[PDB]
Every structure is written in structure tokens, then in C-alpha cells.
């Protein structure tokens, strides 16, 4: 499969340091589908600029240093550099995900001449307003609103294209529930104009990167102990292992085996205490006596 198989570790793979709009956009314009990489910024000493060509455009996927912990490219925390180049391989930066490194130029990279992904294509994108709202809540659907900024940050379809909220988050989001600022054109009489709607005239360049926008946390304290059950927000299924056996007694009343040490892929929690998970082929009814939640993310001995 691979898609991308690009070492993601290795300065000489994808980090060219020394780079900038000035070079990033002229070495990743024209010639490059899933070409992508990450240059030292110069914003300020910390952050980077993940720098992906496709759809014939180049998206600037900005690195943020946290204090020391991991690193914040567009809200989406990973514990590394190495971590983020992961998900992006399988979340489509656009219609393409990460695949293979530009050439080299500044600090050394991986290195190639030429490209044998030769593109196909352009457009513009970049401000768009929801004038619709669709509330699909997710990262896969961007809940906007009547009013929302969004700005088109990957586009994998035609129909759907993924843009970032104001809170700079990343789903797909229908086109015919959008309107470009790049289309100033008469639909339903915009000589109302309203273009300037409600915000402050500040003409920054943003970048690709998905704006968090941090409205202020109220509620922001270090994990103390981490002695409750679920201390991780809901991303899926929950991950717990039999730490006694459950043999086909119970006589046969949904009683789901569980061996020791196996684990329990619950999707389905009752509140009585009864949950019902799959294992192997089977569905059955668990205590919580019978398993213990544990942190599905172990950093330690694999990552």
C-alpha cells in the first residue's frame, strides 16, 4: 500500500530549515502532487512551515513548539514531527496526502532532481463564507453556521471541499452551502454588498494553517494523577482488557468469553454497568468488574 512511504524521522527526508515563503513557494509551485516540507519559520524561532503542494497549490501547514511536551500544527496536537506526518497520511491534506518530499535546495533533505508527478489543474480558494450552515460536527464535517469564515484549506472533491473554520478547524463542507469572496459576482443582488459584514480591517497572512483561535481558557489545568476512568475526550471505540477470563457459562445469557489479556473493543456502554463489545464475531454483555479501562495511548515501550 505505503502511499507514503517517506521516512518520517529524517532531517534528510523532508526538512530543508533555512526556506520561507520567498523559496517554499517558487520549489513547490508547478511541478509537484504530495510534495510537501518543513523549513525552519520566520515567524519566530519555534515555529515551522509544513509547506504541501497539491491541487497545484501550496499549503502551509504551520508547526507549533509547545512548552516542551509536543508540537500543535493547526490546533491538532502531536507529540513530534515524526507523529503529525502519520495522520496526514491518512487525512488528505487535499486530495492527496502526503506522499513523497520536494527536492533539495537550503538544509539537506531528501533530494531529488525532478518529479514524475506532473499536476493537472488549478484554482484559487482561500476566503469562503457558509451562507447555508450545516452542523455535520466533526473533522470530517465542519459545523458552520449562517455566517461562518471558512477558509479552503484542502480540497479532495469537487462538491465537497474541506476548509477551516473560525476556530480553524478542518472537515469537508458543501459547496453549494458556500460562497467564495473570490467570485464578487451578482446571484441574488449583491448590491447590498455586506462584504465588509462585522470584523476588524486586519490584513494578515495567515497561512494554511488551521487557526485555533484560543478564546481565552478558562479551564486549563495540568492531568493530576489521571485516576479517572476516562480522562480522554470520545474519538472512538473504548479499549479494555479482560483481566480475568469469562468462559461460555453465565449459561449462555449474553456472556461474552473474554480470555486474559485480550482486548475487549467496547462500543457500547449501558450506565447500569453491562456493556456490550465486540470480540472476535460476538456481542455479549461484560461487567466492568471483568475489564479494566486503561489509556489506549501508552507512550511508553511502543511510540
Known amino acids: 500500500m505505503s502511499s507514503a512511504r517517506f521516512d518520517s524521522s529524517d532531517r534528510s527526508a523532508w526538512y530543508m530549515g533555512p526556506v520561507s515563503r520567498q523559496e ?3 520549489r ?6 504530495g510534495m510537501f516540507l518543513v523549513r525552519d519559520s520566520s515567524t519566530c524561532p519555534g515555529d515551522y512551515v509544513l509547506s504541501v503542494s ?3 497549490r501550496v ?6 513548539s509547545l512548552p516542551n511536551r509536543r508540537f500543535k500544527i493547526g490546533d491538532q496536537e502531536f507529540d513530534h514531527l515524526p507523529a503529525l506526518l502519520e495522520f496526514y497520511k491518512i487525512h488528505y491534506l487535499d ?3 502526503l506522499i513523497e518530499p520536494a527536492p533539495r535546495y537550503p538544509s539537506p533533505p531528501m533530494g531529488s532532481v525532478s518529479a514524475p508527478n ?3 489543474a488549478e484554482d484559487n480558494l482561500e476566503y469562503v463564507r457558509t451562507l447555508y450552515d450545516f452542523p455535520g460536527n466533526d473533522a470530517e464535517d465542519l459545523p ?3 455566517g461562518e469564515i471558512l477558509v479552503i484549506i484542502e480540497k479532495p472533491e469537487e462538491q465537497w471541499w474541506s476548509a477551516r473554520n473560525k476556530d480553524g478547524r478542518v472537515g469537508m463542507i458543501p459547496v453549494p452551502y458556500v460562497e467564495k469572496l473570490v467570485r464578487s459576482s451578482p446571484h441574488g443582488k449583491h448590491g447590498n454588498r455586506n462584504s465588509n459584514s462585522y470584523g476588524i480591517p486586519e490584513p494578515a497572512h495567515a497561512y494554511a494553517q488551521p487557526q485555533t483561535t484560543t478564546p481565552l481558557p478558562a479551564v486549563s489545568g495540568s492531568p493530576g494523577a489521571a485516576i479517572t476512568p476516562l480522562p480522554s475526550t470520545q474519538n472512538g471505540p473504548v479499549f479494555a482488557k479482560a483481566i480475568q477470563k469469562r468462559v461460555p457459562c453465565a449459561y449462555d ?3 461474552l468469553a473474554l480470555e486474559v489479556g485480550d482486548i475487549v473493543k467496547v462500543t457500547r456502554m449501558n450506565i447500569n454497568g453491562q456493556w456490550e463489545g465486540e470480540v472476535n464475531g460476538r456481542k455479549g454483555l461484560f461487567p466492568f468488574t471483568h475489564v479494566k479501562i486503561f489509556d489506549p495511548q501508552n507512550p511508553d515501550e511502543n511510540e
Open 144 to 146: 458552520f453556521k449562517k
Open 54 to 56: 497539491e491541487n497545484s
Open 118 to 120: 506532473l499536476p493537472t
Open 95 to 97: 486530495t492527496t496526502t
Open 28 to 33: 513547490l509551485q508547478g511541478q509537484r502532487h
Open 24 to 26: 517554499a513557494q517558487t
Open 253 to 255: 445469557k449474553t456472556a
Open 59 to 64: 499549503s502551509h501547514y504551520i508547526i507549533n
